[PDB]
Design a binder for this molecule. Structure first.
Ligand SMILES: [Zn+2]
Ligand SMILES: [Zn+2]
Lengths: 644, 644
């Protein structure tokens, strides 16, 4: 029989003998360094295993939702001893079997395998002094000290022996849950050298240095943490940066999402997007509604390991493709994403807690391939920022801010997401595929699969991520925005049952969304419905409670909305000075103070004439500042009126 | 409003004016050449469309399961006129909407868009003389001749206007079903030149020619059809060879399959398979339990277009990998499968009906990569043909036949599949992944995804297949056999509720399976349960009815089981002479008659001494036959006893 043979096979590498201050026990090694044993076997600071001492990093007792004991403790051993990951053998729920086997192994009961027959649920048990729950009953005169032993059946490890009453034997039922699941973070990981890929170099030291205005203005942000030994860290870094991946919350597209899909794909058809493919040249060198390949960003794999930038490939005015074509025929597509730590400014917390953001750069091949595939889709969205596309990607706030309120419905609502790009369950990509599918792109939905399921080359490792939207791929913003559209709809449909999406007016830019409806909706109620779809929603502008969003307090890019005094329907996109002060204090190339400070003024002046003058006054309080060619308020304000 | 704008957008390219002998009607073009119109608009042999005559290839009326009229006819136009595929806009079920729009367009009612408000189900209607079903009711004084018009709502095309009663308007509800779905065959297809890939050459004329024994023996098989113009064909060939893909029947792994999974993965652990990776060299040049790369088979993409065989890459005794490594780093993996028409012998029917089998060759890169990935798994299965692996792949019938009946349970059952490899729903691969996942290979389940979702380069086209097991990839046999194991279990579990899989004894070789259980099961009942999982099962040996399988009639490879007269427990694998007669009559290289006829004798002699002597006698009735070095019965029979 294979049930017996199974019991032996599991035991051969996942069952060991453990000695506590309360005798020998059979112990199931569940995964890595995690093993379980009966609670009454009170684990101490250390423990004797197959001959010698092993320390306990930390132990955990187990109880249920009622507080009732489960009679299971999950200890953690301090050693390089890796158990076979046998979590998958543990059932997801309390399992009964008509032909179970008790596995015990101590110096008192060596290699014991008992055919205990039927294994049914006992429910509530009253085991010596301490009442227990989630137990299984098998009718076999279980003797003392067989505790710890495991109960299996062909292909399943269902219970842990914890006791008996002379006639019967009892075991605490085992469930997958009980061990932090491996469906999140990463799917699998391992040494790049073991799977053909090469090691990725990464600048260790940051390229952000204090600017000429570091003391002129105040600020608290600092360059993000970039290596393991940054003394500013207050936690393990490796662990901290990967804690972004939270793993799939859902797989299936439910009715709400399908109808969210139907409606939004529906809206996109009034746009009459050109469902053709985009020629290589246009995808590369740009066309109407689409800027050429960004030369700043990385070239990705395998172009980084071969030392070859995007500049060395493109002929800006020659507009030559031959070079790029030969590459696409050679290295194909669907290539691993190179992963860098994003070198940027971060808050006091996100430095201490190592929350440095990661860059996953798509290979130039994918990059170009997806532009040929979705180029026309992108151009459509860029030439149409609004409430049809539901996208603000490509907009020009100086001008677009005056249209937004016209486009918006009567009662605004909005909220903040928390690690949006990574919280996107594979179910949302399928939803996204469906939308394409409906607007005449079902032809190349395979590319979304590429975004959902992607392997990354981190530094020393390669790993595959099943879920979440990568950060450095073509279309990222638009696809995130489109996905966002699907989400708001889904949540509205589920919360406010029988809503009317045709009066949903919203605009997204990635995770950022400004929405509206003729009736005031409850952000709170939605944020809850959000949990179910694996999304973490909190009140807009990092606010304490969910409050009513007004035109006086809503913010759409990091900017506010304020009417002009001379023309009540011209709306200034007001960027808070604090953000500008932060940014001006650091620089990655002090040969651009002119372009950098310039760019900031174009944001700062919408703060009012009184404000913007102080700002220049301060820039001009130091030599590098006075020697700068900066626009006066009128020059800008005047130009801004002719803008429209 | 976007509901209105939708109605217009759909109409712009999917609504046209059609004139029958009974006036003008609004007509919805649904996809390709398929369009619908009201039944009472009685379509003739031709029809006037936007100005001129268009012939009707064929028309179809529609009724329901009761026979009741639906008032819809789906005509087919004879022209290069492709409608936008808008099947996805059609809901899957009878849809109601609170805000519908009637779209009409004739010379009498140009560009008509009526906000008909709420659209509810009428159920049974009594429309002028002919009672109708699946109708929708909207309260708007619909006037005569607005029939044909469509009813939409944001993102959905839900009904076809068919009439009214003065106060209300009625429409036959639309459903996706109504148009042969596009979830099968192929997922998408199109010109290789449009997606970088090159054209694939294919020998037009067959390499099978009559052998020296074509008239000596009798037979009816012939070389398979290989090109469009073979005069033997009785149907369109292109269409006929692709009719193999039947499209996904299921996506989700249900409880029966998960438990089939649990049990079988369970069994495989007694084997203690080496869950490591296999070094490149062994994966390439062979090791214990694994033969080296097959040099006969194709090199695949892009090695075929570059004109470079596997021989020019491998150093049989040098065992050099550098050459292969540099290739894997260059062209990566997960490459399209090159598709050839398998040049083989076929029956009278399968020639007439163009059912020529297709070869989808995996790139040598995938090929080697999967051997490194699953090499150890394969070796385990080859060194263990039996009822543990549930696999006969790698067995040596001359010897293995005597073990099979010992290994088998007491009551045999078996059946035939129909296009098994292609009927495998994506749900079965997920199940397969789970099995790996449990036996310590979850680490490289991505490779199964490669088998499930694969693009092929046919000749002039590239297309992606979502579902079904490709024919020329590494592990095909083993993975098909493992999948088969999962299926039998699933069907047993669902039919004979509360079965006991530990007394299931079976052995598979691809789709071929010989199974048993202590109780006689009903193949019939199982074949039915099979339908639900997208599988087509019929009685074993192309038999008329499902009968009781006995040792006297069961067949496991194309061979029967017959005990030896001198040793009742030695079992001859008896290959039917007919198969041998067929095979001997053709050859692809007449410089091998020696090796070919030889090989046949090693099969033929288990048919008995009287038989095998006639067989030589006939081979030796012609010059090319007498001049052959062929083994006598004793020589073989004697050797066969020392075999074991
Ligand atoms: Zn992966
Ligand atoms: Zn595909």
């Amino acid at each position: 029989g294979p049930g017996f043979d199974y019991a032996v096979a599991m035991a051969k590498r996942n069952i060991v003998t453990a000695t506590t201050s309360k005798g020998e026990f059979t112990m199931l090694g569940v995964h890595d360094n995690v093993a379980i044993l009966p609670t009454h076997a009170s684990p101490g600071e250390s423990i004797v295993i197959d001959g010698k001492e092993v320390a306990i990093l930390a132990a955990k007792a187990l109880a249920d939702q009622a507080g009732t004991n489960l009679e299971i403790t999950i200890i953690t051993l301090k050693r390089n001893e890796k158990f076979r990951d046998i979590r998958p053998h543990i059932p997801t729920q309390i399992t009964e079997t008509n032909d179970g086997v008790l596995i015990v192994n101590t110096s008192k009961y060596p290699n014991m395998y008992v055919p205990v027959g039927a294994v049914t649920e006992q429910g509530y048990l009253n085991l010596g002094g301490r009442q227990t729950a989630r137990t299984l009953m098998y009718n076999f005169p279980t003797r003392a000290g067989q505790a710890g032993g495991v109960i299996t059946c062909t292909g399943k490890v269902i219970g842990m022996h914890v006791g008996g009453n002379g006639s019967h034997g009892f075991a605490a039922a085992l469930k997958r849950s009980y061990f932090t699941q491996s469906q999140g973070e990463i799917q699998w990981m391992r040494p790049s050298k073991e799977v053909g890929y090469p090691i990725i170099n990464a600048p260790s030291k940051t390229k952000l240095e204090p600017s000429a205005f570091h003391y002129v203005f105040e600020g608290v942000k600092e360059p993000a943490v970039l290596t393991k030994n940054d003394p500013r860290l207050k936690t393990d870094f490796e662990e901290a940066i990967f804690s972004k991946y939270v793993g799939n919350k859902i797989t299936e597209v439910d009715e709400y999402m399908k109808e969210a899909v139907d409606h939004y794909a529906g809206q996109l058809m009034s746009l009459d997007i050109n469902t053709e493919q985009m020629c290589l040249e246009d995808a590369m060198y740009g066309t109407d509604g689409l800027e050429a390949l960004d030369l700043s960003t990385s070239a990705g794999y395998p172009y980084v390991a071969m030392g070859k930038k995007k500049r060395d490939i493109l002929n800006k005015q020659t507009r030559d493709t031959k070079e790029m074509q030969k590459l696409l025929d050679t290295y194909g597509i669907n290539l691993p994403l190179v992963t860098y730590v994003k070198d940027e400014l971060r808050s006091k917390t996100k430095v201490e807690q190592g929350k440095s953001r990661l860059i996953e750069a798509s290979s130039l091949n994918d990059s170009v391939a997806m532009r040929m595939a979705f180029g026309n889709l992108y151009a459509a969205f860029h030439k149409n920022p609004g409430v049809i596309t539901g996208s603000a990607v490509g907009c020009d706030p100086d001008l677009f801010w005056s249209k937004i309120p016209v486009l918006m419905e009567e009662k605004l609502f909005a909220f903040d997401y928390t690690g949006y790009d990574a919280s996107l369950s594979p179910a949302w990509f399928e939803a996204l595929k469906m939308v394409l599918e409906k607007i005449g792109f079902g032809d190349r939905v395979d590319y979304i699969d590429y975004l959902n399921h992607s392997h990354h080359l981190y530094k020393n490792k390669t790993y595959c991520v099943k879920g979440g939207m990568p950060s450095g791929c073509s279309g990222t913003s638009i696809f995130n925005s489109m996905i966002n559209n699907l989400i708001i709809r889904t949540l509205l449909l589920k919360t406010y049952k029988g809503i009317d999406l045709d009066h949903l007016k919203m605009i997204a830019y990635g995770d950022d969304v400004i929405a509206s409806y003729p009736h005031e909706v409850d952000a709170s109620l939605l944020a809850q419905s959000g949990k179910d779809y694996g999304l973490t929603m909190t009140p807009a502008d990092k606010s304490a409670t969910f409050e009513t969003v007004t035109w006086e307090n809503v913010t759409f890019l990091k900017r506010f909305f304020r009417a002009d005094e001379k023309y009540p329907f011209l709306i200034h996109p007001v960027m808070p000075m604090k953000e500008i002060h932060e940014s001006i204090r650091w620089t990655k190339d002090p040969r651009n103070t002119q372009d950098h400070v310039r760019s900031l003024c174009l944001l700062a002046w919408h703060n009012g004439e009184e404000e913007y003058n102080k700002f220049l006054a301060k820039i001009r309080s130091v030599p590098i500042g006075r020697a700068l060619d900066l626009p006066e308020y009128s020059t800008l304000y005047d130009r801004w009126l002719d803008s429209f």
